[PDB]
RNA sequence: GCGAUGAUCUACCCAUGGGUGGGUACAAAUGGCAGUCUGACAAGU
């Protein structure tokens, strides 16, 4: 994170920061903190590009899609890794499956708290659906319509 | 001998092993996991003084082992000791690898290697009860195949029956054995070569060792226990065999 | 009075000894099962009650690496168990087996709590029956002396040197018939004053404490208007404490 | 020209960089072998440049199995792709050193500018690395290599032998041992509470012999006095009033000469009786679990003889493995009565054979053998 | 996917050679007949090689033998009929397992060593 | 309508009852071994 942050904050070479993040995720595809930071960097890069477009046009959903594909592969590899860390029988495997799903979707709630905000939460809950967590999700739906 | 007799334990010349003197003398190793005989042998028990405990010793049968046969015939040097690391090639089961593990004790380790899987299951159960052993259920001619499990073992023992005995010993001992490290081979003449005689087989295999840079120190034949068998003790030199 | 039941004392101390023995053997068997699954916990934590509470806390190496065990173990031993659970050599269990192991650990915890409850009950019983001997030598040693001698009356009838010797009868009679030197402590070794003395002072304090214990015993077994506040025992402890402190202040070497 | 070498450890991979190429013609010399041994010279020969540990025990198992097969795992690909400089693939390929000639070609097919050497000089460097071990890492690698060896070895060997969960029988052995000790201690503690309350009520102590019912009776009856007709019907809801035992004990309680005890004594007696009752409940639970595990692990033997006796045979032979290893007369070692017991020994040995060496056994052949022994009994 | 539990099983020519040495050994009193006698010879150490039937009902009752064979380094074969094994063994009843024991002053020594060489290369 | 998936063999009285007798694992015994040390000095100045 620190080398990527120095590179993007002082010299601002977004391609270099991208390659740094991809290498770091190749080494540690287990760390939700590093996944979180990659998503945050991509979001900041998108907002900077948007504001540069705004000031350019002022003088004279692809982005959400890439952040959300990063979220999708985040959920895939985090599920795989929380399973493989402590790989048994029917009840044991089923209980472990419930615990893994609980952990993954608590992390996605943290992604929501990190959070076209409406479109972002919309596609997150779309991937989610595709008990109490279901209630919290439909609560998120109602509060999104409030927002 | 019987179910109630009383004996006097005594330290042998080699450390780790003991003699049980009575009306007939019994080779003995200190039992590590006490209360369960592995291959059904009788076992001695002393009581030692906190409240005292019951320590247990285990008899070593030389009509079953091919290392207690060497001990009883009298080997001047055996490189297995109370604190070392021993690589055991051809470890069929506890019937010898458990006694070797009781000799090296809780400080040292023993890596047992077997190919076939039913003795593998026996080895897995016995190694679960005994922590000094790590088991490998893989072919012993492929140290590259199991290189991630072994680091710089200190002696090698060989109970391999296959006729490539000297080459498989040379491979494992170049890979893992330490310098100036003890090699102990149990040669079976009938398995190595059936047509020619046992002495010819023995001279031939000591020649193969000396070619593969193991300097043989001694050679015993262990005659009242097995026929046509031999134990060669050598030292792995790697630097100036002369 | 309804509370003066030395039969309840001797039954309680016999139950205490058997309870300790059986709790020990059941703890060993529980260590055997959960060492068949977890072969490092036995060499990490030898406290059998801690073993049972750890088994009640987690039932698998992942729950060992996730849940918190602060009230059971210190933090360094806790993280050491966590790394051992990360790399454990033993197999994994099925659910009915984990049920039975959990029930066995609950049995161990219940027996430990029952032993503590019974020990406190016996202590209050001694403070109700022979409070002066309780103030002198302690509840455990008082119950052991009463249990050895049978009844409080027989223990009061015995002289003081017998109350000193009372435990070491094997070595006593062997030395007597062999013409050797007789043992000097007896059962009074585990009283606190003999636990504070050092060597020849342990011998002399065993003698003085035995004399004062015989005084207290003859008071309590034969009192008609017993105060049940133990002032005789308090003053005997005062005299023994003063004697011991003076005998420790007395020095052997040169200055 | 052996520029980089790769060493694989149970806690992850490491890549060293060669500082000096030792000379190649004098490699069988005493001076060069002793420079391998001395740590004063291996520091001049090899420096560590990278080290990446494994993430978990399962990935260590999978990566060790993959090194054993000789293919390139993902973590290996990651470390090599980080460390190796992309030189040209025609002129001056980089040179890696590898312990395995078989591992070589997969490295080449992955990275096309790397040449993998496994000669005696590379074996010499790798032997020096393995010898000096933990000292080379300058302090990095946490976790102890010995514990890592033992865990990874047991896990890899179990995976290669394809171990099971059913054929485990130490649960059976320890369950029958615990059944024996529970029965002995429940009898002891039940006699203890029986005496310790028959001191207060010897008529009841003489009347009701059964220990669990006696414990329930002491749990109900606090004193021998506060026992009315509703409590009489409460004992009728308990054991039996049609036998009249409730009437007998209420008459003996109304006429009792037992010495009255203190309230703390009665409370502690109640606590002890509660403890004994819970122990009896645990014993019944253990019995039923033992019957279930015998029907799962040894159904043929348990069909032929019984759950508890089958557990006795297993625990006395030592394991089901040894019981099926043994002959058909030593299991008897473990007139018509003697001959029929010998026949039963033969047949229980055969049932032990099939029950162990099948993978999931079958009560059909259990029942076949049982029906055969029963037909032989009818023949006698 | 795996091997059958009976494996290694013998070709018909090797089966004929095996049963020939079985009958001559039973004629000259070198053959122990039955799974118990075979296991006893494996413990006592007197056996030379083992023949086992690969169709008895069921296969596990004699499948206890290869574990002892592997731990004591004895070769073993699986012939496909206990009926033919009992016939060539000279019993009035099918045998499922036989043990050719060792002897040194035996008339059939090179016959036993020939078939045992064939078995050791079969494994 | 047999058998290698195993045939055969491994103390005294009263014409398949009771009465003598010996031997191995576990319990109870206020049954036995089995008898509760010495007795005027000691320490300081």
Swiss-Prot record, chain B:
Segments for region (Helical):
197-229
UniProt subunit comment: Component of box C/D small nucleolar ribonucleoprotein (snoRNP) particles that contain SNU13, NOP1, SIK1/NOP56 and NOP58, plus a guide RNA. Interacts with snoRNA U3. Interacts with MPP10, NOP58, SIK1 and SOF1. Component of the ribosomal small subunit (SSU) processome composed of at least 40 protein subunits and snoRNA U3.
What is this protein for, i.e. what is its function? S-adenosyl-L-methionine-dependent methyltransferase that has the ability to methylate both RNAs and proteins. Involved in pre-rRNA processing by catalyzing the site-specific 2'-hydroxyl methylation of ribose moieties in pre-ribosomal RNA. Site specificity is provided by a guide RNA that base pairs with the substrate. Methylation occurs at a characteristic distance from the sequence involved in base pairing with the guide RNA. Involved in the biogenesis of the 18S rRNA.
Write the protein's name.
rRNA 2'-O-methyltransferase fibrillarin
Q: Does the keyword S-adenosyl-L-methionine apply?
A: yes
- PTM comment for this protein? Methylated by HMT1, forming asymmetric dimethylarginines (DMA) within a domain referred to as an RGG box, made up of repeated Gly-Gly dipeptides interspersed with Arg and aromatic residues.
Transmembrane feature ranges:
none
Q: Which GO terms describe its molecular function?
A: histone H2AQ104 methyltransferase activity; O-methyltransferase activity; RNA binding; rRNA methyltransferase activity
- Record-listed cross-link Glycyl lysine isopeptide (Lys-Gly) (interchain with G-Cter in ubiquitin), residues: 66
What's the chief localization of this chain? nucleus
Swiss-Prot record, chain C:
Question: Per the database record, which ranges form the Nop domain?
Answer: 129-249
Q: Where in the cell is it found?
A: Nucleus, Nucleolus
Determine the domain of life of the protein's source.
Eukaryota
* Location of cross-link Glycyl lysine isopeptide (Lys-Gly) (interchain with G-Cter in ubiquitin): 127
Disulfide-linked positions: none
Other facts: Present with 34700 molecules/cell in log phase SD medium.
Give the similarity note: Belongs to the NOP5/NOP56 family.
Q: What does this protein do?
A: Required for pre-18S rRNA processing. May bind microtubules.
Assembly information from the UniProt record: Interacts with SIK1/NOP56 and NOP1. Interacts with the trimethylguanosine synthase TGS1. Component of the ribosomal small subunit (SSU) processome composed of at least 40 protein subunits and snoRNA U3.
User: What is the protein's given name?
Assistant: Nucleolar protein 58
What organism, scientifically named, is this protein from?
Saccharomyces cerevisiae (strain ATCC 204508 / S288c) (Baker's yeast)
Gene expressing this chain: NOP58
From Swiss-Prot, chain D:
GO BP, one example?
Answer: rRNA modification
Give the note: Present with 13500 molecules/cell in log phase SD medium.
Which key words tag this protein in UniProt? Answer: Nucleus, Phosphoprotein, Ribonucleoprotein, Ribosome biogenesis
Domain Nop spans what residues? Answer: 297-380
Result of changing residue 350 to R: Reduced growth rate at all temperatures
Q: Which organism is it from?
A: Saccharomyces cerevisiae (strain ATCC 204508 / S288c)
- Role: Required for 60S ribosomal subunit synthesis.
Q: Where in the cell is it found?
A: Nucleus, Nucleolus
- Taxonomic lineage of this organism? Eukaryota, Fungi, Dikarya, Ascomycota, Saccharomycotina
Q: What's this protein's family per the entry?
A: Belongs to the NOP5/NOP56 family.
Disulfide pairs?
Answer: none
User: Tell me, how does this one assemble?
Assistant: Interacts with NOP1 and NOP58. Component of the ribosomal small subunit (SSU) processome composed of at least 40 protein subunits and snoRNA U3.
Gene Ontology annotations for the cellular component aspect, listed alphabetically: 90S preribosome; box C/D methylation guide snoRNP complex; nucleolus; nucleoplasm; nucleus; small-subunit processome
* Molecular function, one GO term: mRNA binding
Q: What is this protein's name?
A: Nucleolar protein 56
Q: List residues, modification Phosphoserine.
A: 319
- In the complete protein, the residues contained here run 3 to 415 of 504
From Swiss-Prot, chain E:
State which residue ranges cross the membrane: none
User: What SUPFAM superfamilies does this protein map onto?
Assistant: L30e-like
| Superkingdom of origin organism | Eukaryota
Q: Where in the cell is it found?
A: Nucleus, Nucleolus
The main location is nucleus
Tell me the disulfide pairings in this chain: none
Q: Which UniProt keywords apply?
A: mRNA processing, mRNA splicing, Nucleus, Ribonucleoprotein, Ribosome biogenesis, RNA-binding, rRNA processing, Spliceosome
Which GO BP annotation is one of this protein's? box C/D sno(s)RNA 3'-end processing
An example molecular function term from Gene Ontology annotations: U4 snRNA binding
GO CC terms on record? box C/D methylation guide snoRNP complex; nucleolus; nucleoplasm; nucleus; precatalytic spliceosome; small-subunit processome; spliceosomal complex; U4 snRNP
Q: Does the keyword RNA-binding apply?
A: yes
Return the InterPro entries for the record: eL8/uL1-like, H/ACA_rnp_Nhp2-like, Ribosomal_eL30-like_sf, Ribosomal_eL8-like_CS, Ribosomal_eL8/eL30/eS12/Gad45, Ribosomal_eL8/Nhp2
- Subunit structure comment from the entry: Binds to the C'/D and B/C motifs in U3 snoRNA. Component of the U4/U6-U5 tri-snRNP complex composed of the U4, U6 and U5 snRNAs and at least PRP3, PRP4, PRP6, PRP8, PRP18, PRP31, PRP38, SNU13, SNU23, SNU66, SNU114, SPP381, SMB1, SMD1, SMD2, SMD3, SMX2, SMX3, LSM2, LSM3, LSM4, LSM5, LSM6, LSM7, LSM8, BRR2 and DIB1. Binds to the 5'-stem-loop of U4 snRNA. Component of the ribosomal small subunit (SSU) processome composed of at least 40 protein subunits and snoRNA U3.
Similarity-based family: Belongs to the eukaryotic ribosomal protein eL8 family.
The name under which this protein is listed is: 13 kDa ribonucleoprotein-associated protein
Lineage in the entry?
Eukaryota, Fungi, Dikarya, Ascomycota, Saccharomycotina
Q: Which gene encodes it?
A: SNU13
């Amino acid at each position: 994170i620190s080398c990527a942050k120095y590179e993007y904050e002082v010299h601002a070479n977004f391609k270099s920061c991208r390659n740094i993040f991809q290498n770091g995720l190749r080494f540690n595809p287990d760390v939700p903190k590093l996944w979180y930071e990659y998503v945050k960097f991509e979001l900041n890069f998108i907002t900077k590009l948007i504001n540069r477009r705004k000031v350019m046009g002022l003088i004279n959903a692809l982005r959400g899609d890439i952040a959300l594909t990063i979220f999708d592969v985040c959920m895939k590899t985090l599920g795989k890794h929380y399973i493989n860390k402590h790989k048994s029988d029917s009840k044991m495997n089923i209980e472990l499956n419930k615990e893994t799903l609980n952990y993954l979707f608590s992390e996605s709630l943290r992604y929501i708290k990190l959070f076209e905000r409406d479109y972002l939460i919309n596609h997150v809950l779309q991937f989610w659906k595709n008990p109490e967590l279901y209630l919290k999700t439909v609560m998120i739906d109602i509060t999104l319509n409030i927002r | 001998a019987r179910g109630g007799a009383k004996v006097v334990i005594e330290p042998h010349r080699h450390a780790g092993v003991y003699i049980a003197r009575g009306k007939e003398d019994l080779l003995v190793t200190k039992n590590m996991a006490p209360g369960e005989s592995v291959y059904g042998e009788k076992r001695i028990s002393v009581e030692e003084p906190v409240p005292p405990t019951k320590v247990e010793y285990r008899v070593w049968n030389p009509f079953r082992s091919k290392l207690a046969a060497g001990i009883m015939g009298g080997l001047d040097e055996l490189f297995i000791a109370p604190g070392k690391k021993v690589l055991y090639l051809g470890a069929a089961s506890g019937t010898s690898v458990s006694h070797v593990s009781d000799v090296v004790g809780p400080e040292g380790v023993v890596y047992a290697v077997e190919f076939s899987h039913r003795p593998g299951r026996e080895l897995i159960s016995m190694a679960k009860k005994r922590p000094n052993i790590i088991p490998i259920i893989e072919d012993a001619r492929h140290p590259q195949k199991y290189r991630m499990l072994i680091g710089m073992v200190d002696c090698v023992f060989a109970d391999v029956a296959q006729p490539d005995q000297a080459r498989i010993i040379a491979l494992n001992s170049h890979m893992f054995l330490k310098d100036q490290g003890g090699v102990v081979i149990s040669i079976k003449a009938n398995c190595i070569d059936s047509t020619v005689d046992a002495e010819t087989v023995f001279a031939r295999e000591v020649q193969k060792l000396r070619e593969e840079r193991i300097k043989p120190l001694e050679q015993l034949t262990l005659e009242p226990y097995e026929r046509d068998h031999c134990i060669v003790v050598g030292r792995y030199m790697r630097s100036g065999l002369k | 009075s309804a509370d003066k039941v030395d039969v309840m004392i001797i039954q309680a101390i016999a139950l205490l000894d058997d309870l300790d023995k059986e709790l020990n053997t059941y703890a060993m068997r529980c260590k055997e099962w959960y060492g068949w699954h977890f072969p490092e916990l036995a060499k990490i934590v030898t406290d059998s009650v801690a073993y049972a509470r750890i088994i009640l806390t987690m039932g698998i190496r992942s729950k060992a690496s996730e849940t918190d065990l602060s009230e059971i173990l210190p933090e360094e031993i806790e993280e050491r168990v966590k790394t051992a659970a990360e790399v454990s050599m033993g197999t994994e269990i099925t659910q009915t087996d984990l049920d039975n192991i959990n029930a066995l650990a609950e049995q161990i915890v219940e027996f430990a709590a029952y032993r503590e409850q019974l020990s406190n009950y016996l202590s209050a019983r001694m403070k109700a029956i022979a409070p002066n001997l309780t103030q002198l030598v302690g509840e455990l040693v008082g119950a052991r002396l009463i249990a050895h001698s049978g009844s409080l009356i027989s223990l009061a009838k015995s002289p003081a040197s017998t109350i000193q010797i009372l435990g070491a009868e094997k070595a006593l009679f062997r030395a007597l018939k062999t013409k050797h030197d007789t043992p000097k402590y007896g059962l009074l070794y585990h009283a606190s004053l003999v636990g504070q003395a050092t060597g020849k002072n342990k011998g002399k304090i065993a003698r003085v404490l035995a004399a004062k214990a015989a005084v207290s015993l003859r008071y309590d077994a034969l009192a008609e208007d017993r105060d049940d506040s133990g002032d005789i025992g308090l003053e005997s402890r005062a005299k023994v404490e003063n004697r011991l402190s003076q005998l420790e202040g007395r020095d052997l070497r040169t200055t | 020209p052996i520029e980089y070498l790769l060493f694989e450890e149970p806690t992850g991979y490491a890549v060293f960089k060669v500082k000096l190429q030792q000379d190649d013609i004098g490699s069988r010399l005493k001076e060069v072998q002793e420079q391998i041994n001395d740590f004063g010279a291996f520091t001049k020969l090899i420096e560590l440049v990278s080290f990446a540990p494994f993430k978990g025990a399962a990935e260590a198992l999978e990566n060790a199995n993959d090194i054993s097969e000789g293919l390139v795992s993902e973590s290996l690909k990651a470390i090599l792709d980080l460390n190796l400089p992309k030189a040209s693939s025609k002129k001056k390929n980089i040179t890696l050193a590898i312990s395995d000639k078989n591992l070589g070609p997969s490295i080449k097919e992955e990275f096309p500018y790397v040449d993998c050497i496994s000669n005696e000089l590379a074996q010499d460097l790798i032997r020096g690395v393995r010898l000096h071990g933990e000292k080379l890492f300058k302090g990095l690698q946490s976790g102890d290599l010995e514990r890592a060896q033992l865990g990874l070895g047991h896990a890899y060997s179990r995976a290669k032998v394809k171990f099971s969960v059913q054929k485990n029988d130490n649960h059976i052995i320890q369950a029958i041992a615990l059944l024996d000790q529970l029965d002995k201690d429940i009898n002891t503690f039940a006699m203890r509470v029986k005496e310790w309350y028959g001191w207060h009520f010897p008529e009841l102590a003489k009347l009701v012999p059964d220990n669990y019912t006696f414990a329930k009776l002491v749990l109900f009856i606090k004193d021998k006095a506060s026992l009315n007709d509703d409590s009489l019907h409460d004992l009728a809801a308990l054991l039996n009033e049609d036998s009249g035992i409730a009437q007998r004990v209420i008459d003996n309680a109304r006429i009792s000469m037992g010495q009255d005890i203190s309230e703390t004594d009665m409370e502690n007696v109640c606590v002890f009786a509660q403890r004994v009752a819970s122990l009896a409940d645990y014993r019944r639970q253990l019995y039923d679990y033992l019957c279930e595990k015998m029907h799962t692990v040894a159904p043929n033997l348990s069909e032929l003889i019984g759950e508890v006796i089958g557990a006795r045979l297993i625990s006395h032979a030592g394991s089901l493995t040894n019981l099926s290893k043994q002959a058909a007369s030593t299991v008897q070692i473990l007139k018509n009565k003697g001959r029929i017991s010998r026949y039963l020994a033969n047949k229980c040995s055969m049932a032990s054979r099939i029950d162990n060496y099948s993978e999931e056994p079958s009560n059909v052949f259990g029942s076949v053998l049982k029906k055969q022994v029963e037909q032989r009994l009818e023949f006698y | 996917a795996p091997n059958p539990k009976a494996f290694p099983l013998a070709d018909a020519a090797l089966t004929q050679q095996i049963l020939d040495v079985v009958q001559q050994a039973a004629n000259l009193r070198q053959l122990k007949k039955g799974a118990n006698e075979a296991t006893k010879t494996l413990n006592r150490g007197i056996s030379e090689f083992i023949i086992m039937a690969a169709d008895c009902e069921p296969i596990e009752i004699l499948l206890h033998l290869p574990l002892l064979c592997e731990d004591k380094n004895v070769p073993y074969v699986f012939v496909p009929s206990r009926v033919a094994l009992g016939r060539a063994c000279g019993v009035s009843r099918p045998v499922i397992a036989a043990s050719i024991t060792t002897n040194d002053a035996s008339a059939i020594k090179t016959q036993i060593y020939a078939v045992k060489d064939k078995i050791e290369t079969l494994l």
